[PDB]
Amino acid sequence: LDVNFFDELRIGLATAEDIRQWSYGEVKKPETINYRTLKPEKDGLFCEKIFGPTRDWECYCGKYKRVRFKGIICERCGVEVTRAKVRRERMGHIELAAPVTHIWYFKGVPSRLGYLLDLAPKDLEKIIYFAAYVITSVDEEMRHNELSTLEAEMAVERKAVEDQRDGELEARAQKLEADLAELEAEGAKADARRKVRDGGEREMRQIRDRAQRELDRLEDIWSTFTKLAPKQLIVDENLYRELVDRYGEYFTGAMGAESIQKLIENFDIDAEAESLRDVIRNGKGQKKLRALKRLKVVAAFQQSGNSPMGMVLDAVPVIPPELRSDLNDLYRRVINRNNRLKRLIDLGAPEIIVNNEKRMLQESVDALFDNGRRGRPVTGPGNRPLKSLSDLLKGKQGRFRQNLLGKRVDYSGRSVIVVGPQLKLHQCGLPKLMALELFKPFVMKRLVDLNHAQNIKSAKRMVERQRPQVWDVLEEVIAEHPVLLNRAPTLHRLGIQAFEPMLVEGKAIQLHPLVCEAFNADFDGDQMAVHLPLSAEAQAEARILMLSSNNILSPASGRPLAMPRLDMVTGLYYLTTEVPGDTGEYQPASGDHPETGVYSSPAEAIMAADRGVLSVRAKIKVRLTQLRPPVEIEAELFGHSGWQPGDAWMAETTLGRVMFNELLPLGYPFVNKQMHKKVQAAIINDLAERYPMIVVAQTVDKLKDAGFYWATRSGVTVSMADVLVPPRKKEILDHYEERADKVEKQFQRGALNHDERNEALVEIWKEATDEVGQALREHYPDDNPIITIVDSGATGNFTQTRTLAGMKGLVTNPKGEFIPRPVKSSFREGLTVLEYFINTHGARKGLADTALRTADSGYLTRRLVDVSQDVIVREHDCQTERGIVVELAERAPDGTLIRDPYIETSAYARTLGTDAVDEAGNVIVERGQDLGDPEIDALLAAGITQVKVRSVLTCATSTGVCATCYGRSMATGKLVDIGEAVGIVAAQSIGEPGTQLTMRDITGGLPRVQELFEARVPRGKAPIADVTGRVRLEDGERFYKITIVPDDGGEEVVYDKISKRQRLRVFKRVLSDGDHVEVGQQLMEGSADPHEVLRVQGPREVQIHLVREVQEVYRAQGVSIHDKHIEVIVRQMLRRVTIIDSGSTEFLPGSLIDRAEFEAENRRVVAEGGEPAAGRPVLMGITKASLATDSWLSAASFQETTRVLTDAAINCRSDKLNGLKENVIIGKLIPAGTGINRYRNIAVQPTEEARAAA
DNA sequence: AAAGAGTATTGACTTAAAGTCTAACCTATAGGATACTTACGGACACGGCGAATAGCC
RNA sequence: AGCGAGA
DNA sequence: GGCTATTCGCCGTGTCCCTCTCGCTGCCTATAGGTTAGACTTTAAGTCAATACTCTTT
Ligand SMILES: [Mg+2]
Ligand SMILES: [Zn+2]
Ligand SMILES: [Zn+2]
């Protein structure tokens, strides 16, 4: 059977010997099962004598029927009596009467047979489908001697044909003499005599033409010989049969697959490989390019021990009888045609019939291995293609991406989800029936242990009728058993989290609200699947790694994802905001009474608020004795070691803020700020950074509770009366309609064309839009429900508010342009019919655009994951000096350090490569620090901008990356572990903001991202500066010519065809003709292809370019992704070098070889004679990088299955099963996280003191 | 010390099963001779190939 | 195999 | 003067197109051999039942 001894997996061409070695028999009849008794036939497609017994442990006839007869073969029927399941294991084989060629190596462009034999594809096809003869052997020296003899014999034949030729000419002459005698002897017409005479000499012209035909037929054949050599096709078999009958010897010409077999027999690989290598080394140009193409496959066969006989097949293997009859029918066709061929050869048949039958057999094998590849697919009942033996493997519905990496699983459930706010963050409701069913084994065990049932089957009966006693035991068993909750699609790592389940009454998984965002799961009919870990390892993994309370911060940007939002944030905003002039406010008036605003303790404040005296949102002064004061008050009152739990201090704030601040931990200082969602996020981020995660969970949960309660009390409701239109709307409408009418009049006088007036109206109405928006904003009070919800950060944006009251605005044309009408009505006021009809365009287009974009995003994520499927941490530190530089703050022209806007995703969570230096002073922060917020603050304060940080790009470790160079784990909040699969995390983080990554020709959306990671030359390829020099732009419409005089160098280069419509990117000032340029300044407007920038500026500059561009496109929509994930991908992109000089070491020119292996070869060859094989770095798309891996089982799982398997087979490639996809497919443990060889084999034992306790 | 039950004998009766033989009834194969002798989306990418010009035979 | 539908 | 090679264009074929879930319909005749199936005649295995003696329990 099989064990863990799978260290290496090998694929290769299977020779006929191997095929008949695998087979346990030889099916030779097209009979599946008897129509009447319904049993397999002898020697059929389901023969029990071959593939085993249908029902286990008896032969066909039944002489032996029990287990003790194990491994015995019954003499009567020959069935080996054993287990029945072996029918899924044993193979047959069909011994083809004539050879056939495997399709994959024939039709898959480039035709590997064609390249191996150097036969043109059309030619080869005509050979192997019996349409044109091919020679396979020829003669040499005796060829010379009989060529002289044959020169004499063709002199004889030419003389004979010329003799008949002149005899025909003389017969013409005599018939012409008779004709002229008739013409000029009898009385005939003046022209009729010349009619017959012209006709006669016309007959002679055709006779001389026939002569020329005979000449041709002889000398052309002689010329065919005089330069004859094999592998030479001959169409028009008439010439072939002529040659054979005249030249039966001196060549052997064949037709079909066996012809190719013979061609491969008389084919020495070493001589052809040497000749091709010589041609490449000395010959240049297109000829070299083809010769290189063939050398690929020719070397593939040379280096490996597999001979090219495997391409032509003598026997076809028979898949075991589980396929069970679409595919089976194809097999029947093959067997029918093979048997008929055998009979035809036996009886003795004309060449035509047997040749046609051979062609039919070839076509049948073709259809079997791949139906529809060549010619129309073989169709079945209902006129549909038969699912060929290869269609099982390819596509979405192929075996690789429906059944191997993705499987359906037992012990799982699914239900709709309903918000439950009463649950703790680490809990999830689970309906009683679903839990009972899922846990039916465990509850059975417990109720048999409890003696509620006598035995297992009685217990199973007990549960199947849900007897009343089986609920208490159920509560006992479910306790302390984690469960995973997935919500498809799992866009990112936080799509699946482990909760502790709890029973709930009715049929609905009660989810915790705070994790809603993590799932993006919103309660209107989403269905969340539930999975149940079983093994001790799985339960530990779920309880520890996956627990919902253990994953608060996003793995992408680390911002808290359990943060309160929507309702809770609104409640907190209402609680912590301050309303001057409210009841119970503070007033310091004296001379008549005290301030009457202060309170002894917060408890006093709540007791007053219970009375209708103190509002929760009034300014007051409370003597706090249990909340830590802010930094300044602590530093003033206590200064050094203020022990707050007993100390008291006077706080001038609102009671609501006090009630809030009690929810934070004891150590957190008093905040005293209005709780915008932003401020909440900052608070939670700081809390997670400082305090342990469990505290973060508890605080977040308390926050949710308070938020919901106070949102209920917040008094936020929507009514028409609460939606206040702006009173100045009509005046603005008139004011801007006046300009619109003016533009209409100017157009009606021909002042401007349609496009110009469309743009003018667009501008006028957009201005009107902004004006009414401003009027509405300033018209609203602050306490309004709508402004309250929007401005608190709870949800929605002011554009929606403005559309709700005021004016919706310009509506998109279904092409994408702007309707110049535009809509002038608020939804509150109610849109008119035509305004609504115009509006529908935009919404329908948006909905449509969502679908295609999510499809493309999913595909992109698949690509990125595959490329990064093997980027996992391996070492703590490589100590590599190399690093990248990040700018941080930029010097102000007046002199000042303004923090760079995009610092939170660039330098945060990075390890310093070199010690910081200040004014050539001491080190503020030395090498090897996480560079968390205080560090960057210190650097900014001291006055340093550029800092050298370590990154994955400049990581010295060959395998994966090291912990330090990668930097901080964004999710865990500390340094990375030695098993984290940072590659998968990176890719998923890039892909997650898909769809929400929208757009508004050079691309700028998800297509632009794809292009950046695909290395595709952009459409708007703006030229870039190459060498510093004064520019001499010339004027060419669509073909700007651009000269640049090199500062030092060679020759200025002019760019023949560059688009004029672009706008020159500004330089040190707008870039203009006559200006000295840089080595990288973008000349024109638009992007630049990354290959060019690489070739100009080395690997570092192209790296920085790619990261900057992708980050830009993402930032353009406001999604924050840390730079490091991108760095990981671009690192994966730059790992291969192109070979210019082969040196003398097995490196074909143009080969894409890994840099680590490149260096290894170099250190191998420096000794024993040095031949440095020069190479240059190169940038290759994500797809190519993935498909260039050293693992065929992963590349095959990825895409374009047929080609990758054919290539790997020809190379006899062996997969070492080191990646993640592979380990998934074969079902052994991934080498990542808890699977690597340092954790996978930990030894655990008690202590000697513990043994003493025993 | 007595009685009842179990562990044996033996014969007597009984029924499944099973090994021949039949028979008859399906079942698989071959053959049929006046003369006729031709069907019925769209984008990316690479590799197999138009149009040109110059040099060499 | 084909239809329709939810997220 | 013509053909081929080194240089461009041009066109054709192949590959890909997110995930998860729910319900419903689609001529004839002649030979020879197998074939089990079906009944007859054996068994072989099973069931009943008389009898009696010995051992254990009350
Ligand atoms: Mg929803
Ligand atoms: Zn048998
Ligand atoms: Zn490193």
Short mmCIF file of C-alpha atoms in Angstrom, two decimals, chain A residues 841-1085:
data_model
loop_
_atom_site.label_atom_id
_atom_site.label_comp_id
_atom_site.label_asym_id
_atom_site.label_seq_id
_atom_site.Cartn_x
_atom_site.Cartn_y
_atom_site.Cartn_z
CA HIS A 841 -27.86 53.72 -15.46
CA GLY A 842 -25.26 54.27 -12.76
CA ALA A 843 -26.65 51.78 -10.27
CA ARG A 844 -27.05 49.01 -12.84
CA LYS A 845 -23.51 49.58 -14.09
CA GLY A 846 -22.14 49.51 -10.55
CA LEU A 847 -23.84 46.21 -9.81
CA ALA A 848 -22.54 44.73 -13.04
CA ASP A 849 -19.02 46.02 -12.42
CA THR A 850 -18.95 44.35 -9.00
CA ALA A 851 -19.13 40.81 -10.42
CA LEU A 852 -16.38 40.88 -13.05
CA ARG A 853 -14.11 42.77 -10.68
CA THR A 854 -14.48 40.19 -7.92
CA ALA A 855 -13.79 37.42 -10.44
CA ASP A 856 -10.58 39.10 -11.57
CA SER A 857 -9.61 39.83 -7.97
CA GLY A 858 -10.00 36.17 -7.05
CA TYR A 859 -7.84 35.13 -9.98
CA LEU A 860 -5.19 37.67 -9.01
CA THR A 861 -5.18 36.37 -5.44
CA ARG A 862 -4.72 32.84 -6.78
CA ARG A 863 -1.73 34.01 -8.77
CA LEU A 864 -0.13 35.88 -5.89
CA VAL A 865 -0.66 33.01 -3.50
CA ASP A 866 0.98 30.53 -5.87
CA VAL A 867 4.01 32.76 -6.41
CA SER A 868 4.34 33.22 -2.64
CA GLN A 869 3.32 29.68 -1.70
CA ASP A 870 6.89 29.04 -0.46
CA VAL A 871 7.84 32.28 1.35
CA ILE A 872 8.06 31.12 4.97
CA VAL A 873 10.34 32.22 7.79
CA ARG A 874 13.39 30.04 8.41
CA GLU A 875 16.00 31.92 10.48
CA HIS A 876 15.93 34.47 13.25
CA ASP A 877 18.65 36.63 11.70
CA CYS A 878 20.99 36.58 8.72
CA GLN A 879 23.04 39.56 9.99
CA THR A 880 23.08 40.86 6.41
CA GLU A 881 24.44 44.40 6.23
CA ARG A 882 22.36 45.18 3.14
CA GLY A 883 19.13 47.10 3.48
CA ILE A 884 16.78 49.66 1.99
CA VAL A 885 16.41 53.35 2.85
CA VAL A 886 13.08 54.91 3.82
CA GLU A 887 12.61 58.67 3.79
CA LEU A 888 10.26 59.35 6.74
CA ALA A 889 9.79 63.13 7.13
CA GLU A 890 10.92 65.45 4.34
CA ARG A 891 12.85 68.63 5.10
CA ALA A 892 10.66 71.70 4.88
CA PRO A 893 11.88 74.56 2.66
CA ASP A 894 11.58 76.90 5.64
CA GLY A 895 13.38 74.25 7.72
CA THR A 896 11.19 71.78 9.59
CA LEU A 897 10.38 68.06 9.72
CA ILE A 898 6.84 67.29 8.58
CA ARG A 899 6.03 63.61 8.95
CA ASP A 900 5.70 61.96 5.57
CA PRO A 901 2.01 61.15 4.98
CA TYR A 902 2.61 57.52 3.98
CA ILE A 903 4.85 56.54 6.86
CA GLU A 904 2.45 54.16 8.63
CA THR A 905 2.76 51.60 5.81
CA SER A 906 6.42 52.17 4.88
CA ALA A 907 8.73 52.35 7.92
CA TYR A 908 6.52 51.14 10.77
CA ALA A 909 7.05 47.55 11.89
CA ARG A 910 10.56 47.41 10.44
CA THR A 911 13.95 46.46 11.86
CA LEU A 912 16.72 49.03 11.52
CA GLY A 913 19.63 47.84 9.41
CA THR A 914 22.05 50.49 10.64
CA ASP A 915 22.32 52.64 13.74
CA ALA A 916 20.69 56.04 13.51
CA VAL A 917 23.04 59.03 13.68
CA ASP A 918 22.05 62.58 14.68
CA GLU A 919 24.22 65.52 13.58
CA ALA A 920 27.10 63.04 13.59
CA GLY A 921 26.19 62.40 17.23
CA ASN A 922 25.34 59.39 19.34
CA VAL A 923 22.83 56.73 18.30
CA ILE A 924 19.20 57.53 19.05
CA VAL A 925 18.20 53.96 18.21
CA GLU A 926 20.81 51.39 17.26
CA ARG A 927 20.62 48.45 14.87
CA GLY A 928 17.97 45.84 15.52
CA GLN A 929 14.92 47.64 16.89
CA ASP A 930 11.30 47.17 15.89
CA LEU A 931 10.84 50.89 15.09
CA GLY A 932 7.53 51.28 16.89
CA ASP A 933 5.77 54.60 17.37
CA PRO A 934 8.06 56.01 20.11
CA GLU A 935 11.13 55.30 17.99
CA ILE A 936 9.81 57.18 14.96
CA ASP A 937 8.73 60.03 17.22
CA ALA A 938 12.25 60.20 18.66
CA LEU A 939 13.82 60.17 15.20
CA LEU A 940 11.52 62.95 13.98
CA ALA A 941 12.22 65.01 17.10
CA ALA A 942 15.99 64.63 16.77
CA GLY A 943 15.92 65.73 13.12
CA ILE A 944 16.79 62.71 10.97
CA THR A 945 14.88 61.68 7.85
CA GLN A 946 16.52 58.84 5.92
CA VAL A 947 16.83 55.57 7.82
CA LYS A 948 18.25 52.28 6.58
CA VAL A 949 15.83 49.47 7.45
CA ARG A 950 16.13 45.75 6.83
CA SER A 951 13.63 44.15 4.47
CA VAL A 952 12.85 40.86 2.79
CA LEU A 953 14.28 42.23 -0.46
CA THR A 954 17.85 42.36 0.83
CA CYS A 955 17.64 39.14 2.85
CA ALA A 956 20.75 36.96 2.64
CA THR A 957 19.10 33.68 3.70
CA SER A 958 18.55 31.52 0.64
CA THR A 959 15.42 29.68 1.77
CA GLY A 960 12.45 31.88 2.58
CA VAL A 961 13.37 34.88 4.71
CA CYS A 962 14.59 35.54 8.24
CA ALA A 963 12.55 36.89 11.11
CA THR A 964 14.49 40.12 11.57
CA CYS A 965 14.65 41.15 7.93
CA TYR A 966 10.94 40.55 7.48
CA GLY A 967 10.22 42.69 10.53
CA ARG A 968 7.36 42.71 12.99
CA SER A 969 4.32 40.51 12.55
CA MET A 970 1.53 42.98 12.02
CA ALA A 971 -1.08 40.64 13.53
CA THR A 972 0.74 39.30 16.58
CA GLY A 973 2.23 42.70 17.39
CA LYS A 974 5.69 41.24 18.07
CA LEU A 975 8.55 39.70 16.10
CA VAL A 976 7.70 36.92 13.67
CA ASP A 977 7.98 33.25 14.56
CA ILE A 978 10.31 30.78 12.85
CA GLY A 979 7.49 29.00 10.99
CA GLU A 980 5.08 31.70 9.86
CA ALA A 981 4.08 31.47 6.20
CA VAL A 982 4.51 35.16 5.51
CA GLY A 983 4.04 34.51 1.79
CA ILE A 984 0.41 33.45 2.07
CA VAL A 985 -0.27 36.29 4.48
CA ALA A 986 1.28 38.75 2.05
CA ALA A 987 -0.71 37.55 -0.96
CA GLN A 988 -4.02 37.44 0.89
CA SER A 989 -3.41 40.93 2.23
CA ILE A 990 -2.78 42.21 -1.30
CA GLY A 991 -5.92 40.56 -2.63
CA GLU A 992 -8.34 41.37 0.22
CA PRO A 993 -9.00 45.01 -0.79
CA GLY A 994 -10.17 43.77 -4.17
CA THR A 995 -13.61 44.92 -5.26
CA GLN A 996 -13.51 47.70 -2.68
CA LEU A 997 -10.55 48.65 -4.88
CA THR A 998 -12.63 50.51 -7.49
CA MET A 999 -11.57 52.85 -10.33
CA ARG A 1000 -12.23 56.49 -11.27
CA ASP A 1001 -5.51 54.91 -21.60
CA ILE A 1002 -3.10 53.94 -18.83
CA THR A 1003 -4.79 51.66 -16.32
CA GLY A 1004 -5.23 52.74 -12.72
CA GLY A 1005 -7.36 50.04 -11.11
CA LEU A 1006 -7.22 46.32 -10.40
CA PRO A 1007 -6.12 45.88 -14.04
CA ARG A 1008 -3.24 48.25 -13.29
CA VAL A 1009 -2.25 46.15 -10.28
CA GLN A 1010 -2.40 43.03 -12.44
CA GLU A 1011 -0.18 44.68 -15.03
CA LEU A 1012 2.34 45.70 -12.38
CA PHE A 1013 2.57 42.14 -11.10
CA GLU A 1014 2.37 40.71 -14.63
CA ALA A 1015 5.40 42.68 -15.95
CA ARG A 1016 3.22 43.61 -18.93
CA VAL A 1017 4.35 46.64 -20.91
CA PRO A 1018 1.78 49.34 -19.98
CA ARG A 1019 -0.43 50.88 -22.64
CA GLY A 1020 0.61 54.42 -21.76
CA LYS A 1021 4.33 53.70 -21.74
CA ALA A 1022 5.75 57.12 -20.99
CA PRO A 1023 9.44 57.35 -21.95
CA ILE A 1024 11.83 57.76 -19.05
CA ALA A 1025 15.19 59.43 -18.79
CA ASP A 1026 18.05 57.02 -19.49
CA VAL A 1027 21.23 59.12 -19.24
CA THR A 1028 21.55 62.64 -17.86
CA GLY A 1029 21.44 65.15 -20.70
CA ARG A 1030 19.92 68.24 -22.30
CA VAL A 1031 16.70 67.40 -24.13
CA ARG A 1032 15.80 68.26 -27.71
CA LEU A 1033 12.15 67.29 -27.89
CA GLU A 1034 10.79 67.60 -31.42
CA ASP A 1035 7.12 67.96 -32.31
CA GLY A 1036 5.40 64.85 -33.64
CA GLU A 1037 1.64 64.28 -33.30
CA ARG A 1038 1.37 60.84 -31.63
CA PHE A 1039 5.07 60.56 -32.57
CA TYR A 1040 6.96 63.11 -30.52
CA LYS A 1041 10.66 62.75 -31.23
CA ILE A 1042 12.80 63.17 -28.13
CA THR A 1043 16.58 63.60 -28.33
CA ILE A 1044 18.79 63.63 -25.21
CA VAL A 1045 22.47 64.55 -25.47
CA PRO A 1046 24.35 62.28 -23.02
CA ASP A 1047 26.29 64.27 -20.45
CA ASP A 1048 29.46 62.19 -20.73
CA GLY A 1049 28.63 59.63 -23.14
CA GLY A 1050 27.90 58.21 -26.52
CA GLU A 1051 25.11 59.23 -28.85
CA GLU A 1052 21.84 61.01 -28.27
CA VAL A 1053 18.82 58.76 -28.83
CA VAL A 1054 15.66 59.92 -30.60
CA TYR A 1055 12.30 58.23 -29.95
CA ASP A 1056 10.50 57.83 -33.27
CA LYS A 1057 6.93 57.21 -32.04
CA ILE A 1058 5.91 58.77 -28.71
CA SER A 1059 2.41 60.12 -28.11
CA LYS A 1060 2.05 63.90 -28.28
CA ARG A 1061 -1.25 63.99 -26.37
CA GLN A 1062 0.53 63.12 -23.11
CA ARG A 1063 1.92 65.93 -20.86
CA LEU A 1064 5.64 66.07 -19.99
CA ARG A 1065 6.27 65.04 -16.38
CA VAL A 1066 7.74 67.97 -14.49
CA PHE A 1067 11.46 68.03 -13.65
CA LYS A 1068 13.72 70.05 -11.31
CA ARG A 1069 9.72 72.96 -13.07
CA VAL A 1070 7.86 71.49 -16.04
CA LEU A 1071 10.16 69.41 -18.20
CA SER A 1072 10.74 71.31 -21.42
CA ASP A 1073 12.83 71.09 -24.56
CA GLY A 1074 16.39 72.26 -23.95
CA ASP A 1075 16.56 71.06 -20.32
CA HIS A 1076 19.20 68.79 -18.81
CA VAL A 1077 17.51 65.56 -17.69
CA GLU A 1078 18.30 62.84 -15.13
CA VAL A 1079 18.86 59.08 -15.56
CA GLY A 1080 15.34 58.24 -14.35
CA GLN A 1081 13.08 61.26 -14.89
CA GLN A 1082 9.86 60.24 -16.59
CA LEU A 1083 9.98 62.19 -19.83
CA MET A 1084 6.34 62.10 -20.86
CA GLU A 1085 3.06 61.41 -18.96
#
